[model samples]
Target: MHHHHHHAMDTYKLFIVIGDRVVVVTTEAVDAATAEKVFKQYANDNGVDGEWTYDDAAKTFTVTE
Candidate 1:
């Protein structure tokens, strides 16, 4: 399928993996500058230093620490 968003609001998804738990996080931002902002914050709050990577092919982000 095809997808599109307003020029200013780009959608982003982060698949976070911490220890034995996994969660998906979503956000809309202008660019990478704001992308993963909240996901990282949440991960930090949970005391996780997860590693993140973006998948352009599937338009998704992944975090595994």
Candidate 2:
């Protein structure tokens, strides 16, 4: 056997759905108290790329068409 170290990672997923079509959005590591807050602001800016609905949850951000 071998010895290794590992811990649970808290990451998030971002999905973009454009008119019944699913597209890869974004994914990143989050370890902050303002994760969602900052994420909202960030997503808002990204949405400005075309203005998509940013629906978020505990660990998911879905941008709708």
Candidate 3:
């Protein structure tokens, strides 16, 4: 069985861990809406394999096993 929980998220800071890098960037919004916008502008159609979250930080968007 699997379990998931919901909780309120903050937008003050963000942690974006990308390919071979971890970039911690701050945002005005808490839902990563603005971050996605900027990332898309530069990484058009670029498949990203990473997980992001709101934890008072920022960084790249990379994923690994």
Give the whole-model CA lDDT for all candidates, comma-separated.
0.73, 0.54, 0.47
Q: Write one digit per residue (lDDT tens) for candidate 1, span 1-65.
A: 98885577678787877667787777887666577676577667877675678786555778777
Poorest stretch of ten by lDDT in candidate 2: 48-57
Ranking by lDDT: 1, 2, 3
- Evaluate model 3: give its TM-score: 0.30
lDDT of 2: 0.54
**Candidate 3: how large is its RMSD?**
11.1
What's the alpha carbon RMSD for model 2? Answer: 6.6
Q: Between which residue pairs do clashes occur in model 1? A: none
Error of 3 at 5 (Å): 36
Leading candidate by lDDT: 1
